[PDB]
Design a binder for this molecule. Structure first.
Ligand code: HEM
Ligand SMILES: *[C@@H]1O[C@H](CO)[C@@H](O[C@@H]2O[C@H](CO)[C@@H](O[C@H]3O[C@H](CO)[C@@H](O)[C@H](O)[C@@H]3O)[C@H](O)[C@H]2NC(C)=O)[C@H](O)[C@H]1NC(C)=O
Ligand SMILES: *[C@@H]1O[C@H](CO)[C@@H](O[C@@H]2O[C@H](CO)[C@@H](O[C@H]3O[C@H](CO)[C@@H](O)[C@H](O)[C@@H]3O)[C@H](O)[C@H]2NC(C)=O)[C@H](O)[C@H]1NC(C)=O
Ligand SMILES: *[C@@H]1O[C@H](CO)[C@@H](O[C@@H]2O[C@H](CO)[C@@H](O[C@H]3O[C@H](CO)[C@@H](O)[C@H](O)[C@@H]3O)[C@H](O)[C@H]2NC(C)=O)[C@H](O)[C@H]1NC(C)=O
Ligand SMILES: *[C@@H]1O[C@H](CO)[C@@H](O[C@@H]2O[C@H](CO)[C@@H](O)[C@H](O)[C@H]2NC(C)=O)[C@H](O)[C@H]1NC(C)=O
Ligand SMILES: [Ca+2]
Length: 595
C-alpha cells in the first residue's frame, strides 16, 4: 500500500484519557487510535475509488475516455431529463412535517463537510472557470447540453471546483485521492460548537464566567438571542439585499445560513445551550465557566443523538431500521466511526424532500402577513427575512404545520434547487444542485450503482428489463439507460434515490443499507454515546429520555401550541397541544454537592 500515516489535520493535540468531555476536534474518542473520527481527516473508503486514471481524474473529464465502454452523460443532461418537473401540485408528503426535511440537514451538517479547494488568496483561475468554462486543475465545469434554456441566458457552463483532499492541498501523487471531512464524524453537536479550536473559542462568551455562547449584540427576537453576525466582508447574506445590510450568522458550521429554516434551527440550538448553562448555574453556583460550557454542551450532544435515533431514523429507514441498527449493546472500540465517502452522497436523499416554498404563520397558525409564503430560492443566504421580518417564531410554526416534499420518481428535485440555486461565491440564482450532486460523485471517485448494490448484498441489474423490475418503473429505467447505457455507470446519487421506498420509510433498499450501516457505526464506535455506561448517570439518562423537539421550541420561543410528535404531519388545531402538556427536562440530576 501507500503511506499509512499521511495527513494535515490540527497538529498538536494530546489526550487527557480521564476527561469526561469530548474534545472539540474529535480526537481522543478512541483510546487505541486517537485520530479515528477526528475532523479534517480523510473520509473513509468502504470500497476502492474509481477514477479515470485510477488515482484522481474523475470520470467525465476526458471526452475520449469511457467508463466500461461508454461516455458518461453530462450531469446537467441527466438533471434535465430525469430530475426536473414542472407541477408542484401533489408532491407533498402526507405524513411528514417540514421538520422532517430540516432535521436531516442538521444531522448531516453535524456529520460531514467536504469543502471545495482554494490556493487563491487573489485567484484569477477562479475567474477562468466562471467566465470561460475552461477545464483544468481544480476547475471541473458543468457544461450545458444542446437545447438547455440556460444556454440562452447563462453562458456555456456552471463553474464547479473540485473538493479538497488530504495530505496536502497541492496537485500531487501517492495513494488514490481521498476527500477531506472538515467536521467530526460523531453526532456531537459540532455544528453548534465548531470542529476547530480556533472557531470554538470565538463562538464562546469568555467575557463572563457563565459558560455562555456569544450572542448577537445588534439584534434581538422578543428578548431572545440570535447568533453573532459573521462580520467578514464580502458577505453572501448582504449581497442578496444590498439595502438591508444584514450579514450571515456565525455558528459552529459554515453553512448555517445556506437557507432560512436552517438558520432557524441553528438559533434554537444556540438558545438551548445558553438556557442550559443558566439552569446549571442556579443549581450549581460554585461551577466555573468551563464546566458550565462543557456540561451544557454534553447535554446538547445527547439531545441531538436522541432525537436522531429515537424519532428521526425510524421514519427514514422504516421496516429496515432493525435490520441495520439493532438495539444498543454498548461501546465497541473495534468499530470504525469514520463517515465514509459514499455516505455523504447517500445522505443527500434529503434534496428530494425540499418543497418549493416556505411559510410564516401567526399565532393562530394562519398566514403571517401579505407575503407569508415565499419561493425557496429567495431564502438562500437570507437572514434579513428573520431579523427584519418577524423573528423565528413564524418560521418555527411553518416547520411544524407545513409538509416536506415527498420523493417521487416522476418529480425529484424542485426547480427552486434545480434551476435557481444560489452559490455563496457567485452572483446568480441559476445553479443546479442535482447536476452538482452528479458532478460531485465523479469528483469523489464514487463506484457505480451496481458496485453498491453488490456491497449491500442486493441484485445487480444487467439489463433494461432488470433495471425496470428493480426501479418498478418502465419509463424511468429507460431514460436512465438511454443516458448511461449500462446500469454499472449510473452515478450512486441518482441510482440510490430512484429506487422505490421501503415500507414505512422514505428511502429505498440501497440507501437504507448505506445509511443504516453508517449510523450503526457512529453510534457503536462512539465512546461518548449517551447510553454508554459512565458517560451520564442512570438518573441523568432517565431525565434524558424525556426530550423532544416540541419542548425545545417551548423553552426557546414564544410558540405555545406545539404537536406531540413533531416529525409526522400535524394539523392545527386538532394535533396541537399547549406547551404545558409536553414533558420538560428535569436537571436536578445534575445538581452536584461538595461535602
Ligand atoms: C433547502 C435545503 C438544502 C439546500 C439549499 C442544500 C444545499 C446544499 C449544497 C449547495 C450542498 C453542496 C453540494 C456540493 O458542492 O457537492 C449540499 C450538500 C449536502 N447536502 Fe444539502 N441542501 C439542502 C437540504 C439538505 C437535506 C434536507 C439533507 C439531508 C436530509 C441534505 C444533505 C446534504 C449532504 C449530506 C451534503 C454533503 C455535505 C458534505 O459532506 O460535504 N441537504 N447541500
Ligand atoms: C404517520 O407516521 C407515524 C410514525 O411513523 C405512524 O405512527 C407510528 O406507528 C408506529 C408503528 O408503525 C408506532 O411506533 C411505536 O409506537 C407505539 C405506541 O403505541 C409503541 O407502543 C411501539 O413501541 C411502536 O413501535 C406508533 O404508533 C407511531 N409512532 C409515533 C412516534 O407516533 C402513523 O401511523 C402515520 N400516519 C399515517 C396516517 O399513516
Ligand atoms: C456575554 O455575557 C455577558 C454577561 O451575561 C453579557 O452581558 C449582558 O449583556 C446584556 C445586553 O448585551 C445586558 O442586558 C441589559 O440590557 C439593557 C441595556 O439596553 C440593560 O438596561 C438591562 O439592565 C439588561 O440587563 C446585561 O446587563 C449584561 N449582563 C452583565 C452581567 O453584564 C454579554 O452581552 C455577553 N457577550 C456576548 C458577546 O454575547
Ligand atoms: C430588502 O430588505 C428590506 C428590509 O430591510 C425590504 O424593505 C422592507 O420591506 C417592505 C417594503 O418592500 C416594508 O414593509 C412595510 O413596512 C410598513 C409596515 O411597517 C409599511 O407601511 C410599508 O408600506 C411596507 O409595506 C419595509 O418597511 C421595508 N423597509 C425598508 C427600509 O424599505 C426590501 O423589500 C428588500 N428588498 C429586496 C429586493 O429583497
Ligand atoms: C465489535 O465489532 C467487531 C467488528 O465488527 C466484531 O468483531 C468481529 O467482526 C468480524 C467482522 O464482521 C466478525 O468475524 C465478527 O463480527 C467478529 N468476530 C468474532 C470472532 O466474533 C465484534 O463482534 C464486536 N466486539 C464486541 C465485543 O462486541
Ligand atoms: Ca460531528
Amino acid at each position: 500500500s501507500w503511506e499509512v500515516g499521511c495527513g494535515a489535520p490540527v497538529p498538536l493535540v494530546t489526550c487527557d484519557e480521564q476527561s469526561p468531555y469530548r474534545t472539540i476536534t474529535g480526537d481522543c474518542n478512541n483510546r487505541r487510535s486517537p485520530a479515528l473520527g477526528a475532523a479534517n481527516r480523510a473520509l473513509a473508503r468502504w470500497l476502492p475509488a474509481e477514477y479515470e486514471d485510477g488515482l484522481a481524474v474523475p470520470f467525465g473529464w476526458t471526452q475520449r475516455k469511457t467508463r466500461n465502454g461508454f461516455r458518461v452523460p453530462l450531469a446537467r443532461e441527466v438533471s434535465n431529463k430525469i430530475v426536473g418537473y414542472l407541477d408542484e401540485e401533489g408532491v407533498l408528503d402526507q405524513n411528514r412535517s417540514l421538520l422532517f426535511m430540516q432535521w436531516g440537514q442538521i444531522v448531516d451538517h453535524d456529520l460531514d463537510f467536504a469543502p471545495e479547494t482554494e490556493l487563491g488568496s487573489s485567484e484569477h483561475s477562479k475567474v477562468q472557470c466562471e467566465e470561460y468554462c475552461v477545464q483544468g486543475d481544480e476547475c471541473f465545469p458543468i457544461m450545458f447540453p444542446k437545447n438547455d434554456p440556460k444556454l440562452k441566458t447563462q453562458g456555456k457552463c456552471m463553474p464547479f471546483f473540485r473538493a479538497g483532499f488530504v495530505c496536502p492541498t497541492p496537485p500531487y501523487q501517492s495513494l488514490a485521492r481521498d476527500q477531506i471531512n472538515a467536521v467530526t464524524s460523531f453526532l456531537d453537536a459540532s455544528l453548534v460548537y465548531g470542529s476547530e479550536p480556533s472557531l470554538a473559542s470565538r463562538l464562546r462568551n469568555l467575557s463572563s464566567p457563565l459558560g455562555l455562547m456569544a450572542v448577537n449584540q445588534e439584534a434581538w427576537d422578543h428578548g431572545l438571542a440570535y447568533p453573532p453576525f459573521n462580520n467578514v466582508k464580502p458577505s453572501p447574506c448582504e449581497f442578496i439585499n444590498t439595502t438591508a445590510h444584514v450579514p450571515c450568522f456565525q455558528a459552529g458550521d459554515s453553512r448555517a445560513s445556506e437557507q432560512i429554516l436552517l438558520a432557524t434551527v441553528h438559533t434554537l440550538l444556540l438558545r438551548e445551550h445558553n438556557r442550559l448553562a443558566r439552569e446549571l448555574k442556579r443549581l450549581n453556583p460554585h461551577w466555573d465557566g468551563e464546566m458550565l460550557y462543557q456540561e451544557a454542551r454534553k447535554i446538547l450532544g445527547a439531545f441531538i443523538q436522541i432525537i436522531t435515533f429515537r424519532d428521526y431514523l425510524p421514519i427514514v429507514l422504516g421496516s429496515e431500521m432493525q435490520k441495520w441498527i439493532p438495539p444498543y449493546q454498548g461501546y465497541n472500540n473495534s468499530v470504525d466511526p469514520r463517515i465514509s465517502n459514499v455516505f455523504t452522497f447517500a445522505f443527500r436523499f434529503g434534496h428530494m424532500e425540499v418543497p418549493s416554498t416556505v411559510s410564516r404563520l401567526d399565532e393562530n397558525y394562519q398566514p403571517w402577513g401579505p407575503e407569508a409564503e415565499l419561493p425557496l430560492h429567495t431564502l438562500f443566504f437570507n437572514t434579513w427575512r428573520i431579523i427584519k421580518d418577524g423573528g423565528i417564531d413564524p418560521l418555527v410554526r411553518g416547520l411544524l404545520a407545513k409538509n416536506s416534499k415527498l420523493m417521487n420518481q416522476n418529480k425529484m428535485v424542485t426547480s427552486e434547487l434545480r434551476n435557481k440555486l444560489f452559490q455563496p461565491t457567485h452572483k446568480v440564482h441559476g445553479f443546479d444542485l442535482a447536476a452538482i450532486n452528479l458532478q460531485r460523485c465523479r469528483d469523489h471517485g464514487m463506484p457505480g450503482y451496481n458496485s453498491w448494490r453488490g456491497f449491500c448484498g442486493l441484485s445487480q441489474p444487467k439489463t433494461l428489463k432488470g433495471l425496470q423490475a428493480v426501479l418498478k418503473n418502465k419509463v424511468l429505467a429507460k431514460k436512465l439507460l438511454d443516458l448511461y447505457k449500462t446500469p454499472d455507470n449510473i452515478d450512486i446519487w441518482i441510482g440510490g434515490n430512484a429506487e422505490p421506498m421501503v415500507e414505512r420509510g422514505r428511502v429505498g433498499p440501497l440507501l437504507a443499507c448505506l445509511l443504516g450501516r453508517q449510523f450503526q457505526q457512529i453510534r457503536d464506535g462512539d465512546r461518548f454515546w449517551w447510553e454508554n455506561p459512565g458517560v451520564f448517570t442512570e438518573k441523568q439518562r432517565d431525565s434524558l429520555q424525556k426530550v423532544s423537539f416540541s419542548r425545545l421550541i417551548c423553552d426557546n420561543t414564544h410558540i405555545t401550541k406545539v404537536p406531540l410528535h413533531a416529525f409526522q404531519a400535524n394539523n392545527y388545531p386538532h394535533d396541537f397541544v399547549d406547551c404545558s402538556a409536553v414533558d420538560k427536562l428535569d436537571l436536578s440530576p445534575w445538581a452536584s454537592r461538595e461535602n
